[PDB]
Design a protein around this motif. Structure first.
Motif, PDB file in Angstrom:
ATOM      1  N   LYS A  87      -9.488  17.070 -17.546  1.00 40.10           N
ATOM      2  CA  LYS A  87      -9.621  15.829 -18.299  1.00 40.10           C
ATOM      3  C   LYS A  87      -8.396  14.942 -18.095  1.00 40.10           C
ATOM      4  O   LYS A  87      -7.305  15.431 -17.803  1.00 40.10           O
ATOM      5  CB  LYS A  87      -9.815  16.125 -19.790  1.00 40.10           C
ATOM      6  CG  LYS A  87      -9.847  14.886 -20.678  1.00 40.10           C
ATOM      7  CD  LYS A  87     -10.096  15.237 -22.137  1.00 40.10           C
ATOM      8  CE  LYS A  87      -8.977  16.094 -22.703  1.00 40.10           C
ATOM      9  NZ  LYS A  87      -8.846  15.950 -24.179  1.00 40.10           N
ATOM     10  N   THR A  88      -8.588  13.633 -18.245  1.00 39.47           N
ATOM     11  CA  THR A  88      -7.506  12.661 -18.194  1.00 39.47           C
ATOM     12  C   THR A  88      -7.406  11.981 -19.551  1.00 39.47           C
ATOM     13  O   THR A  88      -8.386  11.404 -20.034  1.00 39.47           O
ATOM     14  CB  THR A  88      -7.744  11.620 -17.096  1.00 39.47           C
ATOM     15  OG1 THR A  88      -7.841  12.273 -15.824  1.00 39.47           O
ATOM     16  CG2 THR A  88      -6.604  10.611 -17.056  1.00 39.47           C
ATOM     17  N   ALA A  89      -6.227  12.049 -20.161  1.00 41.48           N
ATOM     18  CA  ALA A  89      -6.016  11.553 -21.512  1.00 41.48           C
ATOM     19  C   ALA A  89      -5.292  10.215 -21.479  1.00 41.48           C
ATOM     20  O   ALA A  89      -4.417   9.988 -20.638  1.00 41.48           O
ATOM     21  CB  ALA A  89      -5.211  12.557 -22.340  1.00 41.48           C
ATOM     22  N   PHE A  90      -5.663   9.330 -22.401  1.00 40.40           N
ATOM     23  CA  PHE A  90      -4.967   8.060 -22.595  1.00 40.40           C
ATOM     24  C   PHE A  90      -3.800   8.300 -23.541  1.00 40.40           C
ATOM     25  O   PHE A  90      -3.918   8.177 -24.760  1.00 40.40           O
ATOM     26  CB  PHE A  90      -5.918   6.998 -23.134  1.00 40.40           C
ATOM     27  CG  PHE A  90      -5.368   5.605 -23.061  1.00 40.40           C
ATOM     28  CD1 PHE A  90      -5.469   4.864 -21.898  1.00 40.40           C
ATOM     29  CD2 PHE A  90      -4.748   5.036 -24.159  1.00 40.40           C
ATOM     30  CE1 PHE A  90      -4.962   3.581 -21.829  1.00 40.40           C
ATOM     31  CE2 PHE A  90      -4.240   3.753 -24.098  1.00 40.40           C
ATOM     32  CZ  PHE A  90      -4.346   3.025 -22.931  1.00 40.40           C
TER      33      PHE A  90
ATOM     34  N   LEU B 148       4.627   3.971 -21.992  1.00 33.82           N
ATOM     35  CA  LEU B 148       3.957   3.664 -20.736  1.00 33.82           C
ATOM     36  C   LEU B 148       2.688   4.494 -20.613  1.00 33.82           C
ATOM     37  O   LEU B 148       2.728   5.721 -20.747  1.00 33.82           O
ATOM     38  CB  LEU B 148       4.886   3.938 -19.552  1.00 33.82           C
ATOM     39  CG  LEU B 148       4.386   3.506 -18.175  1.00 33.82           C
ATOM     40  CD1 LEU B 148       4.462   1.994 -18.039  1.00 33.82           C
ATOM     41  CD2 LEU B 148       5.190   4.188 -17.081  1.00 33.82           C
ATOM     42  N   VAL B 149       1.568   3.822 -20.350  1.00 31.95           N
ATOM     43  CA  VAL B 149       0.287   4.477 -20.141  1.00 31.95           C
ATOM     44  C   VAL B 149      -0.194   4.167 -18.731  1.00 31.95           C
ATOM     45  O   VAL B 149       0.277   3.234 -18.076  1.00 31.95           O
ATOM     46  CB  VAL B 149      -0.767   4.047 -21.181  1.00 31.95           C
ATOM     47  CG1 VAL B 149      -0.338   4.473 -22.573  1.00 31.95           C
ATOM     48  CG2 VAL B 149      -0.998   2.544 -21.126  1.00 31.95           C
ATOM     49  N   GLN B 150      -1.148   4.969 -18.266  1.00 29.96           N
ATOM     50  CA  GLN B 150      -1.775   4.782 -16.963  1.00 29.96           C
ATOM     51  C   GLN B 150      -3.147   4.149 -17.175  1.00 29.96           C
ATOM     52  O   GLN B 150      -4.061   4.795 -17.695  1.00 29.96           O
ATOM     53  CB  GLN B 150      -1.891   6.111 -16.221  1.00 29.96           C
ATOM     54  CG  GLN B 150      -2.275   5.972 -14.760  1.00 29.96           C
ATOM     55  CD  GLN B 150      -2.059   7.252 -13.980  1.00 29.96           C
ATOM     56  OE1 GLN B 150      -2.140   8.349 -14.532  1.00 29.96           O
ATOM     57  NE2 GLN B 150      -1.782   7.120 -12.687  1.00 29.96           N
ATOM     58  N   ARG B 151      -3.288   2.887 -16.771  1.00 28.01           N
ATOM     59  CA  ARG B 151      -4.542   2.167 -16.950  1.00 28.01           C
ATOM     60  C   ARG B 151      -5.515   2.424 -15.802  1.00 28.01           C
ATOM     61  O   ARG B 151      -6.698   2.685 -16.036  1.00 28.01           O
ATOM     62  CB  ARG B 151      -4.273   0.665 -17.095  1.00 28.01           C
ATOM     63  CG  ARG B 151      -3.601   0.015 -15.894  1.00 28.01           C
ATOM     64  CD  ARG B 151      -3.226  -1.428 -16.189  1.00 28.01           C
ATOM     65  NE  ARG B 151      -4.397  -2.243 -16.501  1.00 28.01           N
ATOM     66  CZ  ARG B 151      -4.345  -3.480 -16.984  1.00 28.01           C
ATOM     67  NH1 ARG B 151      -3.177  -4.062 -17.217  1.00 28.01           N
ATOM     68  NH2 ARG B 151      -5.468  -4.141 -17.236  1.00 28.01           N
ATOM     69  N   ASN B 152      -5.036   2.349 -14.561  1.00 29.08           N
ATOM     70  CA  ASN B 152      -5.862   2.620 -13.394  1.00 29.08           C
ATOM     71  C   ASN B 152      -5.030   3.319 -12.331  1.00 29.08           C
ATOM     72  O   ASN B 152      -3.893   2.923 -12.061  1.00 29.08           O
ATOM     73  CB  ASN B 152      -6.463   1.331 -12.817  1.00 29.08           C
ATOM     74  CG  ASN B 152      -7.239   0.537 -13.847  1.00 29.08           C
ATOM     75  OD1 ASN B 152      -8.353   0.905 -14.221  1.00 29.08           O
ATOM     76  ND2 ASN B 152      -6.654  -0.561 -14.312  1.00 29.08           N
ATOM     77  N   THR B 153      -5.607   4.362 -11.732  1.00 32.07           N
ATOM     78  CA  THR B 153      -4.979   5.077 -10.631  1.00 32.07           C
ATOM     79  C   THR B 153      -5.658   4.838  -9.290  1.00 32.07           C
ATOM     80  O   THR B 153      -5.049   5.113  -8.252  1.00 32.07           O
ATOM     81  CB  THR B 153      -4.968   6.587 -10.913  1.00 32.07           C
ATOM     82  OG1 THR B 153      -4.438   6.828 -12.223  1.00 32.07           O
ATOM     83  CG2 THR B 153      -4.121   7.324  -9.884  1.00 32.07           C
TER      84      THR B 153
ATOM     85  N   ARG C 128      -7.418   4.700 -27.590  1.00 29.76           N
ATOM     86  CA  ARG C 128      -7.956   6.055 -27.644  1.00 29.76           C
ATOM     87  C   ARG C 128      -9.105   6.152 -28.638  1.00 29.76           C
ATOM     88  O   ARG C 128     -10.050   6.920 -28.422  1.00 29.76           O
ATOM     89  CB  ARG C 128      -6.850   7.045 -28.005  1.00 29.76           C
ATOM     90  CG  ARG C 128      -7.307   8.492 -28.037  1.00 29.76           C
ATOM     91  CD  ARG C 128      -6.131   9.451 -28.079  1.00 29.76           C
ATOM     92  NE  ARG C 128      -5.287   9.230 -29.253  1.00 29.76           N
ATOM     93  CZ  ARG C 128      -4.009   8.854 -29.220  1.00 29.76           C
ATOM     94  NH1 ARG C 128      -3.383   8.647 -28.069  1.00 29.76           N
ATOM     95  NH2 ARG C 128      -3.350   8.685 -30.356  1.00 29.76           N
ATOM     96  N   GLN C 129      -9.046   5.385 -29.728  1.00 22.60           N
ATOM     97  CA  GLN C 129     -10.166   5.342 -30.660  1.00 22.60           C
ATOM     98  C   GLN C 129     -11.350   4.600 -30.055  1.00 22.60           C
ATOM     99  O   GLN C 129     -12.496   5.047 -30.168  1.00 22.60           O
ATOM    100  CB  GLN C 129      -9.732   4.681 -31.969  1.00 22.60           C
ATOM    101  CG  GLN C 129      -8.885   5.575 -32.856  1.00 22.60           C
ATOM    102  CD  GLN C 129      -8.238   4.822 -34.002  1.00 22.60           C
ATOM    103  OE1 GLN C 129      -8.145   3.595 -33.981  1.00 22.60           O
ATOM    104  NE2 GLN C 129      -7.785   5.557 -35.010  1.00 22.60           N
ATOM    105  N   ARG C 130     -11.087   3.460 -29.412  1.00 23.70           N
ATOM    106  CA  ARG C 130     -12.145   2.711 -28.742  1.00 23.70           C
ATOM    107  C   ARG C 130     -12.907   3.593 -27.760  1.00 23.70           C
ATOM    108  O   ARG C 130     -14.141   3.651 -27.786  1.00 23.70           O
ATOM    109  CB  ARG C 130     -11.539   1.497 -28.032  1.00 23.70           C
ATOM    110  CG  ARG C 130     -12.371   0.930 -26.888  1.00 23.70           C
ATOM    111  CD  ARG C 130     -11.667  -0.250 -26.238  1.00 23.70           C
ATOM    112  NE  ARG C 130     -12.321  -0.669 -25.001  1.00 23.70           N
ATOM    113  CZ  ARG C 130     -11.789  -1.508 -24.118  1.00 23.70           C
ATOM    114  NH1 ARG C 130     -10.585  -2.026 -24.326  1.00 23.70           N
ATOM    115  NH2 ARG C 130     -12.461  -1.830 -23.022  1.00 23.70           N
ATOM    116  N   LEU C 131     -12.182   4.287 -26.880  1.00 25.12           N
ATOM    117  CA  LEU C 131     -12.839   5.068 -25.837  1.00 25.12           C
ATOM    118  C   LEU C 131     -13.745   6.141 -26.426  1.00 25.12           C
ATOM    119  O   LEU C 131     -14.844   6.381 -25.913  1.00 25.12           O
ATOM    120  CB  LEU C 131     -11.795   5.700 -24.916  1.00 25.12           C
ATOM    121  CG  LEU C 131     -10.941   4.716 -24.116  1.00 25.12           C
ATOM    122  CD1 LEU C 131      -9.813   5.446 -23.408  1.00 25.12           C
ATOM    123  CD2 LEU C 131     -11.793   3.946 -23.121  1.00 25.12           C
TER     124      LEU C 131
END
Ligand SMILES: [K+]
Ligand SMILES: [K+]
Ligand SMILES: [K+]
Ligand SMILES: [Mg+2]
Ligand SMILES: [Mg+2]
Ligand SMILES: [Mg+2]
Ligand SMILES: [Mg+2]
Ligand SMILES: [Mg+2]
Length: 191
Positions: free
Chosen positions: A1-4, A45-50, A69-72
RNA sequence: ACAUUUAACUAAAACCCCUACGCAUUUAUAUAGAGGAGACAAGUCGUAACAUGGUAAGUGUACUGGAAAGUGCACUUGGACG
């Protein structure tokens, strides 16, 4: 899994495409300069797109990280895509008994209702030599129990030099299921 | 229920009843069908036990499962343990 979540201070790449907390594009910069920004503004810092060739990270507050994280999780609950198809497999013998074949047939049925793929292999038995056509009969016996619930994903094919047959079963698609009901109804009207 | 009569110059003669056993009761055999144990044999599906048997085993009980069995609770060592 990939976490925000916050990536942290150690960034994987050296060159980092960065965005602002408000979404303003700050362009590409070195990870050493990004860490200085995170400290000067007290941001994470978060990762939006890789997928992008230049790694895209965005500065965000703890409150923002929470809202996203709630939205997703509200989207995935509304649209819970069943991502993985699981390939179950059963290796059978030509001389398998009826009680054992009835047990494994009930097991195949439960895999089809769960929308799995069932790879069925039939191998020549011990002290027993069988015509390859006879081995193929078992496939039709197994599928006959599921007349309108399953169909050959891959038709029976010889494998290992013809020593053992192979196959893959699947659940009928909704269109294929309505067709079966239609064809079955037409026969009822005829009779 | 039945009730002693005749006879008696020696003495004898009369005397003769009917209700049960059945759709009851006891036990056993025969028979539709459904199961168990053992023997022979070692097909089928797993590998439960025996080695710390590869999740230590077992007792009681409960639930669950093609099948051995699994899991819970307490208990036993007929296991181990700086
Ligand atoms: K065991
Ligand atoms: K043991
Ligand atoms: K027990
Ligand atoms: Mg697999
Ligand atoms: Mg074992
Ligand atoms: Mg064991
Ligand atoms: Mg136990
Ligand atoms: Mg269980």
């Amino acid at each position: 899994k990939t976490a925000f979540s916050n990536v942290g201070r150690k960034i994987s790449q050296r060159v980092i495409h960065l965005f602002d907390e408000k979404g303003n594009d700050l362009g590409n910069m070195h990870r050493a300069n990004v860490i200085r920004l995170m400290d000067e503004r007290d941001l994470r810092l978060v990762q939006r797109n890789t997928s992008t060739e230049p790694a895209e990270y965005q500065l965000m507050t703890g409150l923002q990280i929470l809202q996203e994280r709630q939205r997703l999780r509200e989207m995935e609950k509304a649209n819970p895509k069943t991502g993985p198809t699981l390939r179950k497999e059963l290796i059978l013998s030509s001389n398998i008994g009826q009680h054992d074949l009835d047990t494994k047939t009930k097991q195949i049925q439960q895999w089809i209702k769960k929308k799995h793929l069932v790879q069925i292999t039939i191998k020549k038995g011990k002290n027993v030599d069988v015509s390859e056509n006879e081995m193929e009969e078992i496939f039709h016996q197994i599928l006959q129990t599921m007349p309108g619930i399953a169909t050959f994903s891959s038709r029976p094919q010889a494998v290992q030099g013809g020593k053992a047959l192979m196959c893959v079963l699947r659940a009928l698609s909704k269109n294929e299921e309505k067709a079966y009901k239609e064809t079955q109804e037409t026969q009822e009207r005829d009779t």
